[PDB]
Design a protein around this ligand. Structure first.
Ligand SMILES: *[C@@H]1O[C@H](CO)[C@@H](O)[C@H](O)[C@H]1NC(C)=O
Length: 311
């Protein structure tokens, strides 16, 4: 089935970006519960540029797709019948999945106006429980020698991969000038990253010019070597983080994980303001500046869209 991994795209390729804030921001209130040392329920706060309106609208669109994937009318229903489905109702839904073991919920859709093939991954069906229960297990990332990722993320993608890639590549063969855009929130953003890499590694026709990744509230996926491999692909990668959202800080960088993907940090919703840390590897200068004063609640809304409950 799957087209083979391409050698030239699987070639093997830093400081801790959270450590300054962990040093500066001091201890949490004793009444604050933590996960991996990051607050679950802190209630306050302890180059760079501001994104433009067009950038914000684009990030909001992909957030909307991510959010709509939690609606059972959309996956497995394959219909656009939900609170924010008016935004995406022109897309043709090609296929959806709800896998058996790892409960990976995903979809492929095509927008002919947009000339875009969309891949969307849902996060967990129980986000609070997912965060609480997260336990990180670094394992070899099989495509690329000398890199590691968390096993559970590989497991989540691997169960849907063979059918999903086959569906995407069929669409791409039929619409060759279309872009392919991958999105997900939370766990779905980790799955989305693995998917974008897989498409890059197996389809010569996809590259930085026509393969895009957008994630919201995405946890760290692998080690610095992995992160450096992701940067080496050149895939446009916009990683959005809402305010004090804990999940982009899990696992903590001190445990040996690192983000790739330019950070788009929402710092205000009135008016919507996004601070962009213009580096391909994460920095100390955006949301990593506020650890450990993180929040589960900031994971549950992006751009005023509820992310994780279809409301
Ligand atoms: C955090 O959650 C714990 C456990 O549910 C609770 O005891 C504590 O009051 C909470 N703190 C804040 C600041 O919300």
């Amino acid at each position: 089935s799957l087209p083979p991994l391409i050698p030239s795209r699987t070639s093997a390729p830093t400081t801790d970006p959270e450590a300054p804030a962990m040093s500066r921001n001091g201890p949490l209130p004793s009444d604050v519960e933590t996960k991996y040392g990051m607050a679950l329920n802190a209630t306050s706060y302890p180059g760079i540029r501001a994104a433009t309106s067009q950038e914000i609208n684009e990030l909001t669109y992909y957030t909307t797709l991510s959010a709509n994937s939690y609606c059972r009318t959309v996956i497995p229903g394959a219909t656009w019948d939900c609170i924010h489905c008016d935004a995406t109702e022109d897309l043709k839904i090609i296929k959806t999945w709800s896998t058996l073991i790892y409960d990976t919920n995903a979809m492929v859709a095509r927008g002919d106006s947009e000339k875009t093939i969309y891949i969307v991954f849902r996060g967990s069906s129980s986000i609070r429980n997912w965060i609480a229960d997260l336990t990180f297990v670094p394992v070899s990332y099989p495509p690329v020698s000398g890199t590691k990722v968390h096993k559970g993320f590989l497991d989540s993608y691997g169960e849907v991969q063979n059918e999903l890639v086959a569906t995407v590549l069929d669409q791409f063969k039929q619409y060759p000038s279309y872009k392919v855009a991958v999105t997900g929130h939370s766990l779905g953003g980790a799955t989305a990253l693995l998917c974008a890499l897989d498409l890059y590694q197996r389809e010569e026709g996809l590259s930085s010019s026509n393969l895009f990744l957008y994630t919201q509230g995405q946890p760290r996926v692998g080690d610095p070597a992995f992160a450096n491999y992701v940067v080496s692909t050149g895939i446009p990668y916009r990683r959005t983080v809402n305010e004090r959202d804990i999940v982009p800080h899990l696992p903590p960088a001190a445990f040996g994980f690192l983000h790739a993907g330019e950070e788009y940090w929402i710092t205000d919703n009135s008016p919507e303001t996004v601070q962009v840390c213009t580096s391909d590897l994460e920095t100390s200068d955006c949301s990593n500046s506020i650890v450990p004063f993180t929040s589960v609640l900031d994971h549950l809304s992006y751009f005023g869209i509820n992310t994780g409950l279809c409301t």
